[PDB]
């Protein structure tokens, strides 16, 4: 049964660490992996580096190639033993997500699988220590929160950057859309992956910026100049696999060439990519030019920038984004002299924690923005949905139009990830931001005679700047974060549409634990999308401040008939989280450009001027509770 | 017997970290330590820093002060629970070395007490791992030698620099001649400690230079200029006591002021010292001048340079 | 200003224990004060006992018949020096609640004022100990949860019984409706206080029963026979004010005569009361008979049973309910030769914790029930609201029709209540039951031509019995708990009414901490009920079970025009919590008998048969998360 299948998968995931050591009387017995697994664990697996990605791709293909599920497990049994463990988790997760046979199946928790990435070394040490200190079945609980002389104000952001859910999501997203993805081999293609790459990262930056403003900090600035020294960050993460940890990066480093790539080769790529944007065409390998069409342009750019296998020219345009992660990651030891592990930037699970991440991503976002700039703005025609008027919006909470945010304690179970020994469970307690539940009530007047179908789009943007209160829509575009997108039908006359925050399309409703999975539930049975991906729920709104920071609440209704695509796909599957994740094996459900109406340049003075009749702005307050 | 005395002191020091948990409900209880009670347990202890040295000195004095050996064990037992462990090892070793009740009491070998300092993290966590991996009485053996790309020629010197014996010696030497040493309190004085300080360190450098030449490398150059950027070094050492490890340093960044001291001050101290050497006299606190005599000169300089408590100013 | 006034009140409340030492040269000057000061300071104050209440009333009056708010503060300040502290808190709170001058003003937290009543002795000891152990400004945190082997299944209920919010509410309720209340003196009268007395206590029992069933335990049985021995309970509460603690009770104790009252006159009173229900009339002091009218009957009975000052005959009918608390409280030392303190039963703040409370209250509830039995059942005419039909109800949560319940950690600040010394704050951490937020969507068809006004009444009742699944409406009456009551207007045609759990009329939205109160907010400024009274929010639904226990969700709509009373009262004041609390200085806003439709006997075998068109039952599940 499916349940049995789930059980088999969980053990593929257990003790990734320990299942190294060949355990193979003739070590040729997985010849398919004599080639792949040229990474022995020594350095860490890099999600960004090309060579690492190549190995990973090779692994996935074998998994995809597996004739049946049983064969799949057998490969994943015997092969795991040789290949680097990180690569293995990566390859398997991709396989589980896509391979039909796996119509059964969650992947074990990333946080749970590698607890060391989620929690600090101190807590991990303590738990391990307590386990040894007194042998006893009794459970061990450790509170990760610590006590420390906080000098840096960046620390304030830690609730966002360090959040477990955020890191997990980032890991999962890359799994759903792998850079290595080869559509020919799989046969299936990931719709608009390049564009999604752009959108997801942009949102992370946008959301990040809202945190800084909530904090009273200015918006992050891009890593425009390669010459500039980076700010330091020390992760305090250990790797349980061996003796090492992610290397910290002290203050103030100018940029060093790696054997693999020169930072100048990088600078070229940036010039090239941006050249083609202006010239409105890119050059394919064939030396043909493909236009940066309005429809296609973002996608093509996304593939080139990341870059994915899909890039029209890898050799010429290079892989700017990925190399950025690699270069930043080994700033400490570019030469590989000292033989030190890379920083957090190397891994999709960890990278969000470093503040540098935002600087780089804003830089890349800028590239996309230049392209967007080339496009013409939106006419009333494009925006408006005639006959429909938005009367008003209200947010209901304990206090209307105010959302309250607080910190909540939570526990993570280490036992699946690290050797438990005698203890039944070792849990680490951490705290994260959370908010009260709320609902939206939108009153819409349907002037038309017949029932209409509308897509409701809701975004949140900060009212205040770093200077004073100024709702300049051009700037707002960067800041706006997507709260929700959903379909509703309106009858003629007045209508009130109520939606609850829980329903939000952006967030993952729930991630099942190992324990949950061993049990056997039914959200449906889907895959790595399953509980993992989606933005985390606690994260839905920015922290705000004790004072109650003012944010613009924007609701827009668009003609659904226009917005939807027609086609024939599946049952109700992982679609909760469509806004950032997309739909399983389906085309992106919205015709509009991701981020619409915000994606193109706005001429207006105040945001308000921009509004059409099917748009509305309600100012609400977010107040944090200490 | 004295050997039974050994067998008690060695498990006093055995596994330092877990003997913390102070477990005395009222802070006031140890008025004996009301003067100190500043550096927590987990923190790294600095042999060089003045404040750390001051605490250490305070600890030793108590140990020296101990009326008898039994009393010595008692205060030590209880003090270890509260003070930082590194400081504790330092203070105790000094006490064992000097205090007359202790002849034929060797200390627990430093390498053995803190294996993590001697061996690389990879063979620390591999060994720890093997212990957990399969429970069994059986012995575990791990070969520290590793396998890796050896990019830096400095690596060649590792046999010398990394040597266990050398590191241990350096630890011990500082114990025999502590910077903090106050002759009035002890009553006894360490003959020519300043000069010895000079000689021992000079020999280490000299010996080091012979290694480089053996290697075919040029002799080491002095760090004369404060401005120059340092070469990086990554130790790959973990501190099991906590999660923490010694931070590595890459190369290429000029020198930064600490809250405790600014680099400019360091430069000053040097020009100060050079002048004194030059005019052949140093100024005491009393503002009297003492000559840099042929006999005395190295010793006086050693105390000032290190500097020890003995420094004239 | 009001804020200043608030500040003055908070210090009346501080260091009550310490406030003793009279420092008064002579009470004679305080002629007003002559009446009070009989009860000694250290002694425990009984809410219940008549003599104690009399002194308390005398004190309040002096505080009332102070001339302006300067005079009120003055006498209070002086009175607090001499009088027993417990009595003092009681008298002052009543004064703050009613006295106009106090149009300003919350009362300091009961939990916060007397932390020792809310938390266990161990935690309190630890905090006190930590304070002394190491002097330092640093904050102290203590987790009250403990570790112990728990032989007694009653322990399971502790989350309900021990809950801080519940105890606080009970304290506050008695303050709003004091037994001692003399309408002539105040001039104002408390509408339907006797009936409310009945309703509130009945609800507590009903809610309690739902917990037991959620637990898998049978419903509580009444203290029908006095001869029977009581089950023991040890509170583990200390009174810091002295060394003393609430005496524990070991099981196997039958009730003993006290000097104050012989258990038999209690038996007579109960018999006298029941006899006079049957006879349908009660005898007044005048020896006139007053009929137990349908309208009046519950109220008259409530006053007699409690009994309040309002009782038509105190001398003959006695005070059964109150004496029950007293007798149970000093079971350990009926003689008082031991000079031991009374148990938890003596105090309104503590009494809910003892399991005996339920047994006694069910007993008293039975008395009311017999009266209800005498009344005729409800015809379709009374129940139905014609033209209105309830199509369906749905509860929206993470999963529709399922409510999730979990345990949440919380902290209580001791500092206001006990001597802090050096420490900035000492907080004790405790855990309580809590549930996810949810909303209700009710579809109603308004057949009539015109808009109607309806009162929506929502109740929850357990589906399962101790036997097997049996929705026998007669039995259900005891179990049904009130979720919410609110007014809505329906237009003709289909209507959907959405209400959020947060809005619930039964619960207190928020209780302000002495810290919040230290600043100055604007919920508005009314008094002891302010944040205090109302049932606690976390408590709104029963725990349920991991399996997801089935509960009947009942929604009924009634004609509002009928339901409301007309009159002219205040601005928007403490009305959030109307269902159990009533409205400030206002008549109870609902004409229907409290608990309607559940109050009278139901002829039908099954609940479904009972339903009229304006009623509906939706089965939902409550599942607890471990």
Q: What is the 3-state secondary structure (H, E, C) of A151-195?
A: CCHHHHHHHHHCCHHHHHHHHHHHHHCCCCCCHHHHCCCCCCHHH
Mutation target to probe the C interface, by most C beta carbons within 10 A, among A410, A432, A439, A493 is A439
Strands A507-508 and A452-462: unpaired
3-state secondary structure A385-439: CCCEEEEEEEEECCCCCEEEEEEEEEEEECCCCCCCCCCCCEEEEEEEEEECCCE
Asked if residues C36 and C101 have their Cβ atoms less than 8 Å apart, the reply is: no
Pick from C517, C526, C454: which is nearest to C490 by CA?
Answer: C454
The 3-state DSSP class for residue A606 equals: coil
Judge whether C285 and C313 are in contact, CB under 8 Å.
yes
Q: Which residues of A touch B239 (CB under 8 A)?
A: none
B24 contacts B127 by C-beta, under 8 angstroms: no
Tell whether residue C170 is among the known ligand binding residues.
Answer: yes
CA distance B266 to A83: 52
| C307 upstream amide cis, omega within 30 of 0 | yes
d(CA A99, CA A107): 13
Helix, strand, coil % over all residues of chain C, rounded to 5: 35, 20, 45
Query: How many C-beta atoms lie closer than 10 Å to residue A374's C-beta?
Result: 13
What are the residues whose beta carbons fall under 8 Å from the beta carbon of A226, sequence distance 6 or more? A255, A263, A266, A267
Short-list C214, C204, C220, CA closest to C580: C204
A23 exposure class (CB count in 10 Å sphere: 0-12, 13-18, 19+): exposed
**Neighbouring residues of C332: CB distance < 8 A, sequence distance ≥ 6:** C247, C248, C249, C253, C338, C340, C343
DSSP assignment string, A336-368:
--S-----GGG-TTTGGGSTHHHHHHHHHHHHH
- Which chains does chain A touch, 3 or more C-beta pairs < 8 A? B, C
Do C476 and C210 form a contact (C-beta atoms < 8 A)?
Answer: no
CB contacts, 8 Å: C132 with chain B: 26
Q: Do residues B239 and B246 lie in contact, with contact meaning Cβ atoms separated by under 8 Å?
A: yes
Residue A490 CA to residue A493 CA, distance in Å, equals 8
Q: How far is CA B147 from CA A38, A190, B153, in A?
A: 15, 41, 16
E strand residue ranges, C463-502? 481-490, 493-500
Let me know how long chain A is: 626
Whether residue B234 and residue A333 make contact (CB cut-off 8 A), yes or no, is yes
Q: Which of A394, A436, A539 is nearest to C502 (CA)?
A: A436
Question: What's the rounded Cα separation, in Å, for the pair C365 and C223?
Answer: 11
Q: Which of C91, C117, C92 has its CA nearest to residue C106?
A: C92
Contact B250 A332 (CB under 8 A): yes
Residues paired with residue A460 on neighbouring β-strands, in sequence order? A481, A553
State the Rg of chain C over Cα: 24
Q: Min CA distance, C426 vs chain B (Å)? A: 17
Query: Residue C287: CB partners within 8 Å, gap ≥ 6?
Result: none
C490 CB-near residues (< 8 Å, 6+ apart): C388, C444, C446, C451, C452, C453, C454, C497
Nearest-angstrom CA–CA distance, C91 and B52: 60
The vertex-C614 CA angle with C608 and C616, nearest 5°, equals 40
| Alpha-carbon gap, residue A382 to A397, rounded angstroms | 34
Rounded Cα distance, A421 and A415, in Å: 9
| B312–chain C nearest CA distance, Å | 39
- DSSP assignment of C56-96 equals HHHHHHHHHTSSSHHHHHHHHHHHHHHS-HHHHHHHHHHHH
Q: Which residues in chain C are closer than 8 Å to A436, comparing Cβ atoms?
A: 437
- Give the separation between CA A580 and CA C6, rounded to whole angstroms: 50
Instruction: Choose the closest CB to B234 out of A129, A133, A340.
Output: A340
Indicate which of C401, C439, C512 best probes the interface with A, i.e. most A CBs within 10 Å of its own CB. Answer: C439
Q: What's the rounded Cα separation, in Å, for the pair C92 and C45?
A: 14
A365: closest CA among A582, A533, A232, A197?
Answer: A197
Burial class (CB in 10 A: 0-12, 13-18, 19+), C193: buried
| Residue C456: its H or E element | strand C452-462
Pairing of strands A426-435, A140-143: parallel
Residues B291 and A42: their CA atoms lie apart, in Å, by 59
C131, C134, C135, C138: which to substitute to probe chain B, counting the most B Cβ within 10 Å? C134
The sign of the dihedral angle between the CA atoms of B283, B286, B291, B295 is negative
Residue B77 to chain C, least CA–CA distance (Å):
21
- A200-232 burial string, b = 16+ CB within 10 Å, else e? bbbbbbbbbbbbbbbbeeebbebbeeeeeebbb
The coordinates were experimentally obtained by cryo-EM
* Residue A421 to chain B, least CA–CA distance (Å): 7
How many other C-beta atoms can be found within 10 angstroms of the C-beta atom of residue A614? 21
Nearest CA in chain A to B124: A243
Could you give the residue ranges of the DSSP H alpha helices within C339-432?
356-374, 380-383
What is the chain B residue with the closest CA to A259? B151
Q: Do B25 and C129 touch (CB under 8 A)?
A: yes
Contact criterion met (CB below 8 Å) for C362 and C205: yes
Question: Count of B–C CB contacts within 8 Å?
Answer: 11
**Neighbour subunits, C (≥3 Cβ pairs < 8 A):** A, B
Is A15 one of the annotated binding-site residues?
no
Residues A288 and A266: their CA atoms lie apart, in Å, by 23
H/E/C letters for each residue in C382-400? HHCCCCEEEEEEEEECCCC
CA distances from B214 to B156, B157, B211, B218, C76 (A): 10, 10, 5, 9, 93
Cβ contact C136–B28 (<8 Å): no
C96 CB-contact burial (10 Å; exposed 0-12 / middle 13-18 / buried 19+): buried
Q: Strand, helix or coil at A507?
A: strand
DSSP string, chain B: -HHHHHHHHHHHHTTGGGG-----S-GGG-GGGTT---S-SSSPP-SS-HHHHHHHHHHHHHHHH-SSHHHHHHHHHHHHHHS-HHHHHHHHHHHHHH-GGGTT-----HHHH-HHHHS-HHHHHHHHHHHHHS--SS-----TT-------GGGGGHHHHT-HHHHHHHHHHHHHS-TT--HHHHS---TTHHHHHHHHHHHHHHHHHHHHHHHTPPPP-----SSSPPPPB----B-TTSS-BPPPB-S-------SS--HHHHHHHHHHHHHHHHHTEEE-TTS-EEE--TTTHHHHHHHHHHT-TT---
Selection from B98, B92, B83, B89 nearest residue B35 by Cα? B83
Alpha-carbon span B301 to B308, nearest angstrom: 10
Spatial contact of A578 and A196, defined as CB atoms under 8 Å apart: no
Task: Tell me the angle at which helices A297-306 and A263-278 cross, rounded to the nearest 10 degrees.
Answer: 170
Three-state DSSP class for residue C322? helix
| B contacts of C422 (beta carbons < 8 Å) | none
> Would you give the DSSP letter of residue C597?
T
Pairwise CA distance, residues C532 & C514, whole Å: 12
Chain C residues within 8 A of A396 when measuring between CB atoms: 500
Given an 8 Å threshold on Cβ–Cβ distance, is A18 in contact with B133? Answer: yes
Shortest Cα–Cα distance, A242 to chain B (Å): 6
CA–CA–CA angle C183, C186, C187 (5° rounding): 70
Q: Report the C-alpha gap between A599 and A369 in whole angstroms.
A: 8
Catalytic residue among A58, A85, A162, A306: A306
Other beta carbons within 10 angstroms of residue A318's beta carbon come to: 23
Pick from A417, A434, A531: nearest CA to A118? A417
> Considering CB atoms only, which of A244, A254, A421 is closest to B132?
A421
**What CA–CA distances, in Å, run from A614 to A386, A452, A475, A600?**
8, 13, 22, 18
**Cross-chain Cβ contact B238/A243 below 8 Å:** yes
Q: Which of B171, B169, B176 is nearest to B190 (CA)?
A: B176
- Longest CA span, chain B: 70
Distance CA A358, CA A484 (A): 23
- Does residue C172 have a known ligand-binding role? no
Instruction: Show which residues of C are catalytic.
Output: 306
Contact criterion met (CB < 8 Å) for B26 and C136? no
Burial class (CB in 10 A: 0-12, 13-18, 19+), C209: buried
What count of other Cβ atoms lies within 10 Å of the Cβ of residue B29?
Answer: 15
- Rounded Cα–Cα distance for residues A602 and A596 (Å): 12
Residue ranges with strand state E in C279-332: 281-283, 289-291
Could you tell me the end-to-end alpha-carbon distance of chain C, in angstroms, rounded to an integer?
A: 48
Q: For residues C137 and A74, what is the distance between their CA atoms, to the nearest angstrom?
A: 61
Read off the DSSP letter of residue A502.
G
- Count of residues in chain B: 313
Q: Shortest Cα distance from C511 to chain A (angstroms)?
A: 13
- SS3 state at A273: helix
Burial annotation C263-298 (CB, 10 A radius, 16+ → b, else e): beebeebbebbeebbeeeebbeeeeeeeebeeeebb
Angstrom distance (rounded) from CA B58 to CA B61: 5
Residue count of chain C? 626
Cα–Cα distance measured from residue B307 to residue C245, given in angstroms and rounded to the nearest whole number: 63
CB contact burial C394-422 (16+ within 10 A = b; e otherwise): bbbbbbeebbbbeeeeeebbbbbbbebee
Strands A615-624 and B281-283: unpaired
Catalytic residues of B: 306
Three-class DSSP category at A457:
strand
Cβ-based burial of A184 (10 A; exposed 0-12, middle 13-18, buried ≥19): exposed
Indicate if the alpha-carbon torsion angle A18, A21, A23, A27 is positive or negative: positive
What chain B residue is nearest to A18 in terms of C-alpha separation?
B133
CA A175 to the chain's CA centroid: 10
Residue A201 counted as an annotated binding residue = yes
Angle between helices C297-306 and C193-215 (to 10 degrees): 80
Residue of C nearest to B23 (CA): C133
Burial class (CB in 10 A: 0-12, 13-18, 19+), A267: middle
Q: Check if the beta carbon of residue C265 is closer than 8 Å to that of residue C318.
A: yes
Q: Is C98 annotated as a binding residue?
A: no
Beta bridge partners of C617: C554
Put simply, the answer to whether B233 touches A338 (Cβ < 8 Å) is yes
Contact between residue B301 and residue B293 where contact means Cβ atoms under 8 Å apart: no
Tell me how far apart the alpha carbons of residues C196 and C173 are, in angstroms, rounded to a whole number.
Answer: 10
- Phi/psi for B267 (5° steps) reads -60, -45
Measured distance CA(A429)–CA(A414) in Å, rounded: 11
User: Listing from the earlier edge strand, what are the strands of the sheet with C402-413?
Assistant: C140-143, C426-435, C402-413, C615-624, C549-559, C452-462, C481-490
Q: What angle do CA A88, A93, A94 make, to 5 degrees?
A: 105
Helix axis angle, B2-13 relative to B69-82, nearest 10°? 10
**CA atoms within 13 Å, Cβ hemisphere of A421:** 26
Q: Which whole-number Å values give the CA distances from A458 to A389, A479, A616, A623, in the listed order?
A: 15, 13, 10, 20
Task: Give resolution in angstroms.
Answer: 6.8
The residues facing C624 across adjacent strands are: C405
Distance CA A549, CA A551 (A): 7
Whether the CB-CB separation of C110 and C224 falls below 8 Å is answered with: no
CB atoms within 10 A of CB B130: 15
Rounded distance between C-alpha atoms, residue C219 and residue C209, angstroms:
5
Report the DSSP beta bridge partners of residue A249. A233
The CA distance from A386 to A401, in Å, is 28
């Amino acid at each position: 049964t499916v349940a049995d299948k789930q059980a088999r998968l969980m053990p593929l995931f257990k003790h990734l660490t320990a299942l190294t050591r060949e355990k193979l009387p003739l070590d040729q017995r997985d010849e398919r992996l004599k080639g792949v697994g040229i990474l022995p664990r020594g350095t860490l697996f890099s999600c960004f580096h090309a060579r690492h990605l190549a190995e990973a791709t090779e692994l996935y293909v074998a998994l995809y190639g597996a004739k049946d599920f049983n064969d799949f497990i057998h490969l994943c049994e015997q092969a795991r033993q040789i290949v680097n463990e990180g690569m293995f988790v990566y390859a398997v997760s991709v396989a589980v997500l896509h391979r039909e046979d796996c119509k059964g199946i969650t992947v074990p928790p990333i946080q749970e699988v590698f607890p060391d990435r989620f929690v600090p070394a101190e807590t991990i040490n303590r738990a391990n220590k307590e386990a040894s200190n007194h042998p006893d079945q009794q459970s061990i609980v450790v509170e990760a929160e610590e006590t420390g002389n906080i000098l840096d104000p960046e620390y304030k952001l830690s609730y966002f950057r360090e959040d477990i859910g955020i890191n997990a999501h980032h890991w999962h997203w890359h799994i759903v859309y792998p850079a290595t993805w080869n559509p020919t081999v799989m046969g299936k293609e990931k719709d608009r992956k390049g564009e999604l790459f752009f959108y997801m990262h942009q949102q992370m930056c946008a959301r990040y910026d809202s945190e800084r403003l909530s904090n009273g900090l200015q918006r992050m600035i891009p890593f425009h100049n390669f010459d500039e020294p980076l700010e330091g960050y020390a992760p305090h993460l250990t790797s349980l696999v061996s003796g090492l940890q992610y290397a910290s990066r002290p203050e103030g480093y100018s940029i060093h060439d790696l054997s693999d790539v020169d930072v100048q080769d990088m600078v070229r790529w940036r010039e090239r990519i941006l050249d083609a944007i202006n010239m409105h065409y890119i050059v394919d390998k064939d030396n043909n030019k493909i236009p940066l069409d309005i429809e296609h342009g973002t996608d093509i750019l996304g593939d080139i920038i990341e870059s994915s296998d899909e890039s029209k020219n890898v050799e010429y345009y290079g892989s700017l984004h990925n190399w950025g992660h690699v270069m930043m990651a080994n700033i400490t030891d570019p030469d590989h002299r000292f033989q030190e592990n890379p920083g957090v930037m190397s891994d999709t699970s960890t990278s969000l924690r470093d503040p540098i991440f935002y600087r780089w991503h804003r830089f890349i976002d800028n590239i996309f923005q230049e392209h967007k700039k080339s496009f013409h703005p939106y006419t009333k025609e494009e925006l408006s949905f005639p006959g429909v008027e938005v009367v008003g919006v209200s947010i209901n909470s304990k206090t209307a139009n105010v959302i309250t945010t607080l910190i909540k304690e939570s526990l993570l179970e280490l036992s699946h990830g690290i050797n438990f020994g005698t203890d039944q469970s070792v849990k680490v307690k951490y705290h994260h931001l959370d908010h009260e539940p709320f609902t939206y009530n939108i009153v819409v007047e349907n002037n038309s005679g017949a029932e209409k179908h509308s897509t409701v789009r809701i975004f949140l943007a900060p009212k205040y700047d770093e200077l004073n209160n100024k709702l300049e829509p051009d700037e707002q575009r960067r800041l706006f974060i997507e709260l929700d997108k959903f379909f509703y039908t309106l009858t003629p006359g007045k209508n009130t549409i109520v939606r609850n925050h829980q329903d939000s399309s952006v967030t993952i409703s729930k991630v099942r634990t190992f324990d949950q999975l061993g049990a056997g539930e039914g959200v449906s049975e889907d895959s790595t999308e399953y509980c993992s991906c989606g933005w985390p729920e606690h994260m839905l709104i920015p922290r705000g401040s004790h004072k109650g920071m003012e944010f613009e609440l924007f609701v827009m209704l668009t003609d659904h008939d226009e917005d939807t695509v027609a086609g024939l796909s599946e049952n109700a599957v992982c679609s909760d989280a469509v806004s950032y994740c997309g739909a399983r094996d389906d085309r992106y459900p919205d015709k509009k450009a991701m981020g619409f109406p915000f994606d193109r340049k706005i001429e207006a003075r105040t945001a308000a001027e921009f509004l059409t009749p099917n748009m509305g702005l309600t100012d609400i307050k977010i107040k944090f509770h200490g």
